[PDB]
Structure formats: structure tokens, C-alpha cells
Design a protein around this ligand. Sequence first.
Ligand SMILES: [Mg+2]
Ligand SMILES: [Mg+2]
Ligand SMILES: [Mg+2]
Ligand SMILES: [Mg+2]
Ligand SMILES: [Mg+2]
Ligand SMILES: [Mg+2]
Ligand SMILES: [Mg+2]
Ligand SMILES: [Mg+2]
Ligand SMILES: [Mg+2]
Ligand SMILES: [Mg+2]
Ligand SMILES: [Mg+2]
Ligand SMILES: [Mg+2]
Ligand SMILES: [Mg+2]
Ligand SMILES: [Mg+2]
Ligand SMILES: [Mg+2]
Ligand SMILES: [Mg+2]
Ligand SMILES: [Mg+2]
Ligand SMILES: [Mg+2]
Ligand SMILES: [Mg+2]
Ligand SMILES: [Mg+2]
Ligand SMILES: [Mg+2]
Ligand SMILES: [Mg+2]
Ligand SMILES: [Mg+2]
Ligand SMILES: [Mg+2]
Ligand SMILES: [Mg+2]
Ligand SMILES: [Mg+2]
Ligand SMILES: [Mg+2]
Ligand SMILES: [Mg+2]
Ligand SMILES: [Mg+2]
Ligand SMILES: [Mg+2]
Ligand SMILES: [Mg+2]
Ligand SMILES: [Mg+2]
Ligand SMILES: [Mg+2]
Ligand SMILES: [Mg+2]
Ligand SMILES: [Mg+2]
Ligand SMILES: [Mg+2]
Ligand SMILES: [Mg+2]
Ligand SMILES: [Mg+2]
Ligand SMILES: [Mg+2]
Ligand SMILES: [Zn+2]
Lengths: 81, 129, 150, 155, 87, 144
Amino acid sequence: VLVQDLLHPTAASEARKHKLKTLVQGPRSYFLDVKCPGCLNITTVFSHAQTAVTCESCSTILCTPTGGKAKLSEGTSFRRK
Amino acid sequence: TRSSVLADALNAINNAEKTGKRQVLIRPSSKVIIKFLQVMQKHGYIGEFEYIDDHRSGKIVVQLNGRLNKCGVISPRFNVKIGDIEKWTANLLPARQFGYVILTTSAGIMDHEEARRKHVSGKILGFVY
Amino acid sequence: GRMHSAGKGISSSAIPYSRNAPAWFKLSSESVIEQIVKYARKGLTPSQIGVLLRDAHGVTQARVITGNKIMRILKSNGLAPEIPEDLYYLIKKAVSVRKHLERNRKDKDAKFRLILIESRIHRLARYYRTVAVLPPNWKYESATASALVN
Amino acid sequence: STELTVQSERAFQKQPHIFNNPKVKTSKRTKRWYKNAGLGFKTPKTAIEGSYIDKKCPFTGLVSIRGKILTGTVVSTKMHRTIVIRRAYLHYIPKYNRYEKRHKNVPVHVSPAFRVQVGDIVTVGQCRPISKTVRFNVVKVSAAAAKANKQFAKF
Amino acid sequence: MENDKGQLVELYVPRKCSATNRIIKADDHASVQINVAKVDEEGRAIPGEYVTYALSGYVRSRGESDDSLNRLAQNDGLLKNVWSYSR
Amino acid sequence: GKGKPRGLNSARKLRVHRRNNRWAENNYKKRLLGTAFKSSPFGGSSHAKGIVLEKLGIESKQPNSAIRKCVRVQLIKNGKKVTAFVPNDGCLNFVDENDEVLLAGFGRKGKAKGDIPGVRFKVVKVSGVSLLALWKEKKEKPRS
RNA sequence: GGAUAGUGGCCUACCAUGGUUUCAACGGGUAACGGGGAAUAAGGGUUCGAUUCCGGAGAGGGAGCCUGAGAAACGGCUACCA
RNA sequence: GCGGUAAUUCCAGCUCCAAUAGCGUAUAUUAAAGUUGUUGCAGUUAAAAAGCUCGUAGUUGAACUUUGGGCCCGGUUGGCCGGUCGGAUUUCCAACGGGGCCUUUCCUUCUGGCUAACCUUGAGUCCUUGUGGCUCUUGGCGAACCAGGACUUUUACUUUGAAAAAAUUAGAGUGUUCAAAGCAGGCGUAUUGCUCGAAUAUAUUAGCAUGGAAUAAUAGAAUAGGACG
RNA sequence: AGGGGAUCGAAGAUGAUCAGAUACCGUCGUAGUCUUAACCAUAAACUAUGCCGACUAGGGAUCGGGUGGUGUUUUUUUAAUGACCCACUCGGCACCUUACGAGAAAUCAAAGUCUUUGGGUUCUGGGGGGAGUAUGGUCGCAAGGCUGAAACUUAAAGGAAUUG
Ligand SMILES: [Mg+2]
Ligand SMILES: [Mg+2]
Ligand SMILES: [Mg+2]
Ligand SMILES: [Mg+2]
Ligand SMILES: [Mg+2]
Ligand SMILES: [Mg+2]
Ligand SMILES: [Mg+2]
Ligand SMILES: [Mg+2]
Ligand SMILES: [Mg+2]
Ligand SMILES: [Mg+2]
Ligand SMILES: [Mg+2]
Ligand SMILES: [Mg+2]
Ligand SMILES: [Mg+2]
Ligand SMILES: [Mg+2]
Ligand SMILES: [Mg+2]
Ligand SMILES: [Mg+2]
Ligand SMILES: [Mg+2]
Ligand SMILES: [Mg+2]
Ligand SMILES: [Mg+2]
Ligand SMILES: [Mg+2]
Ligand SMILES: [Mg+2]
Ligand SMILES: [Mg+2]
Ligand SMILES: [Mg+2]
Ligand SMILES: [Mg+2]
Ligand SMILES: [Mg+2]
Ligand SMILES: [Mg+2]
Ligand SMILES: [Mg+2]
Ligand SMILES: [Mg+2]
Ligand SMILES: [Mg+2]
Ligand SMILES: [Mg+2]
Ligand SMILES: [Mg+2]
Ligand SMILES: [Mg+2]
Ligand SMILES: [Mg+2]
Ligand SMILES: [Mg+2]
Ligand SMILES: [Mg+2]
Ligand SMILES: [Mg+2]
Ligand SMILES: [Mg+2]
Ligand SMILES: [Mg+2]
Ligand SMILES: [Mg+2]
Ligand SMILES: [Zn+2]
């Protein structure tokens, strides 16, 4: 306070903020390849679905819509990319 | 709704100075803010500044020295008539030996003294001292 | 902000800086435009496509991997509705509220809401109308609005 | 307004002293006169190609255009062969050092060489008093129709 | 504040706050001038010889007196990792 | 901005609102309604000459006990009837009923003077002369 | 078309339904002739101008007209009213 | 606010003040008044936020589209020098301005008429070892504007200029004895005449004319009825 | 205009009190209080404090939403839930402490960023009475609402704070 680097804010105090009040704004959601080992292939899901994402071939389920982040269902794995 | 993007940057700058800060971050920048920002800096009322680039309208960080008591904005951009530029400075500048009334003329955003030397006039928007 | 209320809810999507890529995104322009159509070919609103394409697929935002906005893709493929979907969804709403008020002439609150919903309509219509997307002298009237939707 | 008929009065409509001798078998039935108004205003072809009479036409009739040249925006095309335009302008009020929107309507004749319609911007020319109120004559349409043709059915 | 010819007319050119470069006037009896000590080898502390800093009454009232001095002294090379320009 | 439109074309509203609000000014409204020419016992004129009906003995307002001595005058251009005061010691002995007198205002712009209730004018001359001069002795009251 | 010195609803005949207006029309008030200008002196203003110059209007009130280049004249005439 | 028995306010004498050939009073208005507020007011409790929301007129309205860099010309103050018998010009130095080039860059446009200007050059050079210098025709600059055709998205703002009655106003010259004024007057050979004047400024809104291209509007190509040929 | 009409209860009637007592207190109790279909449009309808936008300063609570946690508790076999705990973040109803600052003060995170006087816009006030009166218009079944003067009078009326 009184003199600080507004141009190079620290990654943490930057990280804790709001998605619009960061330096330059950008999302804080993410995508993921997801597999329920009944099948073999990997469907790409949105961390904040809304739509209860219907799996590829087997209409099994996958995730459920929520407040924000989707709840993935039962026995499933992932990765953020 | 946001009404004069100049007004906000200017006031920010002033509130910072007043509270003893050295930097503002202003939002959302424009051609005009820069040109205004540039004019103050030319006579040293602020340090350097940086345009950061949100893929939007922009942000600006200004560095303040402390040499600045006031930078105001003239809210309706009145026409001034080369004769009437005198009447403005008189109204709202501390003395005749320093401070500038800045204004937008056909041939560029410029403080009144430059405007005098170049023999152009136009609309008025703000001031520094 | 918040035009017909006192709400101050700052709250939107934070669209990404990178106006291209994902690069870990395969597919193609080709790939998703065909995908855009069939869903609107099933009748889906461009937003519904937007949500649908976002989750199940990896459409981060349709414009970025196909230089054009969803509604514009549709207009090209001869698909766009007779009226914009937002204006559509207001009219549909003012219908259901009216239908209610007719059935509940004792519900002053609804009468109030109807006003708002309509005065939001007529302002929107006036925008669209100014900018040629509607014919001049297009007009929302209660009498013939339950027509316009269903 | 003119439209059709043309020989539609109690009197026979003709251009004065433009005589067509019946003895000389002609291929144009009517010799027709016209001028160039000047000030670089094109006499439109519909003036020459036409067959309307209108003595108040600045290209086919007996009026000189001289004085003010004015441009306004069409507001009324209700009266046969003359229109009324609105001349908007902002008026400066010193004590407050600001302005206020003002306007004036100006009635002006309009030759059936032009086909004008409400909304069009029109350049008009000062002439001798043509009627009780009219002192101008319409001399170029700047406008068109205001993008009307791109207002058809659904895609 | 000179004059027509040279001559430094008008007395008294006041101190400015080391932290804000604002004037430190007379009735500002809440402003402060700190002397930090020049020293030599193996402790010791060269009397009369100080590196000095001046802080406005405003600043001290606002609580920024410490922090701001932290910066000032440190980037004069007499504090060794205490401050941080980023936050 | 609190209130007043700041804009560059808002000059009409800015004049209108001023026209409007001037009416709350006392002397502007008096002036424009023509309150002078209409009310007011004089014309709107500086003085007026009337005729003396009865001689009055107006008792003064508190905390002042006295008897103030006045004249009911009937203005000649008017027949408007008016009570007026007769300054300085005596002087009432100068007037008499049916006399001509010159009335002037009291220098309160309308509004009565001191402890004299009701009186808004004062005498200046009588029978042609000058009350003041008769008081001194520079002049004398004309025959009839 | 007539009338005028001549444009023009100026007037007439036919025909049409137009013209103005919250950007204040239309109506009312004015102890209103307009202007150059006058008074008040930080500036911005506020108030005033019957009245030495320019324009306009009038000759007790209305209308009418003769003469003439020029008047709808009044130190011209005609009629009515006072 | 004084006066109801010692009246610093009345009625007088004395003495004293202010302005003075003039001074009082009445009415109006102007200043004081930021108590009408554009500049520039006030509205929790002093006068003053409509019970509440919608809303047309009206006012207002986010950001972004030729910017940066390179070359050339010639001005106007001022400096250190003055060449010269108070002010002068070259080069030395800055500073502030104007113009015109090239950078992917309409300058409305073709068809001759004009050329003033160099990439030219046709010779050589007054003369400081020479790009310091201008006259100088036979291949090669357009726009500087002629005049005829063919056509031009709209505006606000600001610039400079023309058109402009006098008296008034501001203000130069002139010793009406001073001055308010007036536009006079001034010099001699005062014997046959010589001569300076009768400025300048303002004149704003509107209309005209010209330069600018920031600020703020406007119009453009999406069912292509697009743009050049 | 119907229905309803327990309760409480303008009016009225009474018991008392009082010099009086048309009241305060006690009793009876009409209308009313509730509801339907229409009116009326006013309250200290109050935060006595327009709305949209920006900026300026600390602190602990709480309400709704969300994110993070090899947190606690629930046992069953660990999870999954749920409630709870901690950190942060939006948007709420408020409080605390300061005051850079504002104010005539009382006080005020707005009543701040105003003689260093201009973000946009709406509305109202201009000494006190006369008086929200008169008059005209308009709305209402009415009661009344909206609009709303002047003559005349007057040197104060008023605000916040201090000492009594
Ligand atoms: Mg709104
Ligand atoms: Mg917001
Ligand atoms: Mg949301
Ligand atoms: Mg017609
Ligand atoms: Mg009032
Ligand atoms: Mg009497
Ligand atoms: Mg009379
Ligand atoms: Mg006719
Ligand atoms: Mg009709
Ligand atoms: Mg009005
Ligand atoms: Mg008159
Ligand atoms: Mg006048
Ligand atoms: Mg006059
Ligand atoms: Mg008169
Ligand atoms: Mg006459
Ligand atoms: Mg007479
Ligand atoms: Mg008559
Ligand atoms: Mg006569
Ligand atoms: Mg005569
Ligand atoms: Mg005595
Ligand atoms: Mg005595
Ligand atoms: Mg005495
Ligand atoms: Mg005097
Ligand atoms: Mg101003
Ligand atoms: Mg006030
Ligand atoms: Mg109050
Ligand atoms: Mg309120
Ligand atoms: Mg803008
Ligand atoms: Mg000019
Ligand atoms: Mg002159
Ligand atoms: Mg009951
Ligand atoms: Mg009773
Ligand atoms: Mg009793
Ligand atoms: Mg009773
Ligand atoms: Mg009320
Ligand atoms: Mg309350
Ligand atoms: Mg806080
Ligand atoms: Mg959780
Ligand atoms: Mg008193
Ligand atoms: Zn599966």
C-alpha cells in the first residue's frame, strides 16, 4: 500500500480474486477427457456442464448439472486438457 | 451508465495523488485518455504509464510523482473561440505563469499554450496544474 | 445495471484472451459447422447449440474455431427464425403470464410483471426494427402473440 | 403525384410556343423542350424522356433557379406535385453557451421528373414565388428509399 | 523562485516528504525527519554522519510511515530483503 | 451533478427552468404582473396629489405610546382613498380639510414605516407650497 | 383565367384534401413601434431604448378616390361616425 | 431603536462632521446578490426529492479503423558575434512554428491547355583543394488552375477572409488658456504660400468565402440487388 | 351493492371523577372491523436523504450463490450424502472503529472526491404570515384529489449546538 506493482501482481493474491477482477480477465473453468471403463474411448467434457452429458455409444450417464461444477458419476477418470 | 471515459481516469488520478499513492490503474482507456495522459507527462505531472491489453477496451497503469495538485475534466466539451481561450485559463488556472488548459483542436489534442503557438482552437476538455 | 429492477449482479462469462486455438482441439471448421446445422436442424436455439456443443464436445466457443457466430452460421444455411430468439423468448413469456392473469384477475403482482415484460419487448422490437432485421411497422400485440409462438 | 392521364385537365396541356406542325409527318408526336438549370445540377432523363407538362418544372418549365440552394429531409408527400421538408438546425444561446434543436418546414414544388418519398433527402433551389407558400423547387434527390428493398419475406 | 534578473527572491524553500514529494510546511508539526546512521567497519557508527529521510505529517497519520520507510531505506541499500514491490 | 442538465444542447431546458423559477422572485413577479399599475394607490408614479378628507389621530404601535397625526386623502387621478402621515412637530396645524396635498411614498418600497400602522405615504406639500418650508418660515400658506 | 406595374389563393371557376403543432402551434397579455444603441464597470450578466441617425406606421376614427412619375396623400377631395 | 424629569436620538442655542454650487426626499432600476446560480446556489434536521415502478417527448450515451519512422524547403523571434558610417545581413547555435515528399497511402475524374518545379543536362564554372552557385536549350514532375465533359454520402466545431453607415464605444494625432468638446491645425518670405491630418479597433448570431480533419454525429457490403474492368 | 357480522369498537347512551368534564377511567353498543364486485388515491406512504456510472478506508458478524480442503462429526466396511469448521470470492440486510474528507453543527463510507467550483440525467425550494386560502380547470357518488394565485400584513419566523 502507497506504492506497489500493479503491473506484476503476485500469482496468489492474483489467484484468489474474482474471474473479472484479475489483471486481464479470463475463465477459471476447464475441459477434461473422460472415460467410464465400460467403454474404451474418451469423451471431452466441460467442468460446468448444465447438460447431463450423454456418453458416446452407451447412453450410460456421465456427469450431472449442479450449482457450478458438474458432478461426475460413479466410476470415472479424467485429465485437464 | 458510463458516460465520459476521460472523466473517470482523471478523477482516479486525482484521488490517488490526494491519498498519497504513486500508481493508479485506470479503466478503460481510449485514444483520448492516452493523448491527455501524454500531455500531462510532457510537462511532468505523471511518470510513465503502460497500456495493458485486455482483449477489450484496455486498462492503463499510471505512475505518479507528486507534482500534481489537480487534473480536472470539462464535462461538456464547449467550443472555445481563440479569443475565449484566455477567459478559460483565467477561470480555472492558479496563475498566469504555469499550469495548462488542455483542449481538442482540429490539429490535435494539445495544451492551450501549444494551441496558442500553432494558431488553432476548438473544443475544451480538461486541465492540469 | 439490471434494467427493470434494482439488481446489481456483476456476473458474466469471462471469455478467454486467446482468440484462437485450443491447439489440443482437433476437429476443424468443417467438423463443427456440419455439427451446428443438424442440431438447429433438430430445432435447437443457437444458445442451446452453444451449451450443447460446449459440454459434450470441445466447442470452447463456436466463433473461435469457425470465424462466425452461431446465429450467422444458421442464417447462411437458411435456418434463422422469423424473429430473433431473445425477442421470441420474451413474447413466449408474456404469453404465459397473460394466460395466468386471465385466470387470476385478482393477481395484481402479475399485472405489474406483464407490463415490465412487454415494455422490455416493445423496446427490443424497436431496436431490431431500427436495424432492418424486422419490417418497419412490426408490432407486438397481445391479441396476436399467442399466434406468434404457438 | 401526377401519374398517368397527362391530358387530364379542362384545358389542353402543352409547352408554350413548342409547335408541332401536323403537315410534317414526325416520329415523336410531340416536340418537347428542356433546359439545363445550371449550378451543375443534372437535368434528369425522366425530364427529357417524360411527357408530363408542369410549367413549374425547373428543367421542362418556366422557372429560373436562383438564390438559396438548401437541402432538407422529406416529411410530407401528401400534396400533389409539391412536398414539405424539414430543415433541422441547432440554435446557439449565449448566456448558457449551449444550443437547442430547432427546425422549420419549407414547402417546395416537385417535378414529376423526380419520384420522391417520405424520408428522402432532397436538394432544393430557390425560385420565384410559385404559390402562396412555396419558394423552392427540388433539383436533386440525395437519398434513395432508405434501404427499403432489403425488407422482404423470411429466409 | 528567482526574479527578473537572477536574484533568489522569496525566502525559504521548504522540505519535501521523502515519500510523497509534497511540501512539508510549518504548522505540519506532525511530520518527521529520521536520521539513519552511516557506519564503518566492524560495528562502529560514524557520528554526525547520517543518511536522512523526511516523512510528511499526512503520511504518518495515514499509518504508512513504517512501510514507506521500509521501501526508502531498503532501496538505498540499507535493508536486506524486508520489503516487496509486488503484492 | 445534482440536478441542472449539463449537456451541450440542453440550453432550452436551461432557459425554461430559469424563466420558471424567476417567478419566485418577488420584484420580478411584481414587475411582470404589473402590480404597480394595478394595485398601489399611486399610479406606479413617484408621488400623487389628493384631497384632504378627515384629519386623523393614529395611535402608534407598541412599545411606543403616542398619537401619530395623519390625513385621509383621496387621490385626484383616482378617487382611491388613502391615509397619510404629516411629519415634524405641529404641521397638522398647517393642513385643514378639503385642501390639496402632495403625497410621496415612505421609502420602504410599499410597506408602512415605524409605529404608524397602516400609513404608507407622507405629506410633502399643501395648498401649493411645501410643508417643510411652512415649518421653518421661508413661506406662507396661500389665501384660499 | 381574370385582375396587377408585375410574381402569388391576390381574386374567380373546376378539382383535390391538405397546411401548423411539446423543437410550444393556435389563443391571451404587453403601462411593445423595431434597430443603431443607454445605464450598471472582475468576468458571466441584469435592466432600458416615446426620444437628435436608419427603417416602419399615422395625421380625431374608419373606408373611398381624384391628380400624378410617385399618394390609397389628409396643412387633397368624397361619404359615414364622433 | 429613542421619549414615562439628570433625553448622547425629540424642540432649540452652542460647538462638531460629510459632500459643497449644490445637497435632501419619493419612485424606478443596476451593483452589493453565489438571495435565480451557464460561469455559480440550495433541498437528512433551516424553504425544497413526486408513495411507488413503467414509460413517450427531451437531454445523455463504453472501447476500436493512418499510426510510427525517413527525407526536403523556406519562414520568425532571440542569442554570441557587426560588416557599418541608432540597425543591418551571411554563416555558428539553439526554440517555436508553416509547407511539401517517400514509406502498400485519391489528389473526384478523364480529354489539352500552363507548365513552376528536377531524377534531368547541355556546355562549363565567378571562385575558399568543391555539389558552397545562377544564368542556361533537345529525351524526362503535374495538379498551381485554366474550360468542356463525366460525378460527387451527410453535418456540427474551429480557423482566416470578404461584405459591411454614420453618431455612440475603445482608442492615435492636435496644447479648445484648462477641460467637457471639436476635427482641427501647423509652418514661413506673415507682400500675392508652404504643409501633417481628418487613423485604428469592435462590429459576436445568421448568410457568404477559405484552411484544418482532433472531438461528436451521419451514410456504406449480409437473402449480396455488392466493388472495380 | 351483496354476504358476513365472534371480536374489538368513531357515534350515541350511561357509572363515576371535576368548579365544570361534552373527555381521560368503567358499562351498553350503531357504523366499522372480515369478504366479493366496484370506487377513493391519501399517511411522519420516513432512511424526513432521486436514479445510473467511477473513485476514495479499516474490522469482526450474518443471509443467498460458488470454489478450494489426504478439515471435524454422522459408521457400516470405508466411502456417497447431510449438518458443522477454516480460507477466498461475488451479490444482500445491517453493525463496529476511524477519518484522509465533508458540515452551521448534530453527524456523515456518503451527507466524501466543491472558490483547486463541470461524469449523465430527473424533480423541488428562494424571508415569515396571508394559505394550500380565493379563482378557473379537471377527476370523484360523496368525502375529497390534482393543478393553484393575489391584495394586505410583518423583522423576523427557523436550524444545530452551549450555558443556565
Ligand atoms: Mg430504467
Ligand atoms: Mg455494476
Ligand atoms: Mg448470471
Ligand atoms: Mg392534394
Ligand atoms: Mg410558491
Ligand atoms: Mg378612516
Ligand atoms: Mg385618467
Ligand atoms: Mg392556382
Ligand atoms: Mg378537410
Ligand atoms: Mg413552454
Ligand atoms: Mg403601444
Ligand atoms: Mg423595447
Ligand atoms: Mg426607438
Ligand atoms: Mg408610449
Ligand atoms: Mg401616410
Ligand atoms: Mg389630437
Ligand atoms: Mg371597423
Ligand atoms: Mg387619408
Ligand atoms: Mg403632410
Ligand atoms: Mg434638563
Ligand atoms: Mg438635554
Ligand atoms: Mg441637537
Ligand atoms: Mg450623493
Ligand atoms: Mg460556461
Ligand atoms: Mg440560497
Ligand atoms: Mg424541512
Ligand atoms: Mg423519496
Ligand atoms: Mg464515444
Ligand atoms: Mg470572423
Ligand atoms: Mg469608426
Ligand atoms: Mg359488528
Ligand atoms: Mg360520548
Ligand atoms: Mg356526567
Ligand atoms: Mg359528545
Ligand atoms: Mg403527500
Ligand atoms: Mg421513520
Ligand atoms: Mg468496508
Ligand atoms: Mg464445499
Ligand atoms: Mg421591533
Ligand atoms: Zn461410457
